[PDB]
Amino acid sequence: IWKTGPLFKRVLMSSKYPDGVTGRIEFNEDGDRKFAQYSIMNLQNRKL
């Protein structure tokens, strides 16, 4: 197996980029993307 694997995941999880291109890169306790950027749409006259 690999011993640095889980350590590499630990280093990747502790990553902060407040001035990134997408916005603010930050990982949570499970390894996902925090501060999601969505857009609430609504269907009006057969158009979004």
Partner: protein, 48 residues
Amino acid sequence: EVIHLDMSLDDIDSKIQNQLKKLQSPVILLYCTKEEATYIFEVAHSVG
């Protein structure tokens, strides 16, 4: 109490011993693999 152990990081922050020190039962079940059981028995062999 059904406890859970983490094998991704080695016992360096004093947590596995704190989770295994509260086991005062005459029989304990171990549900994990081999390379993990060698480490659990390795730390438990030093703790008691």
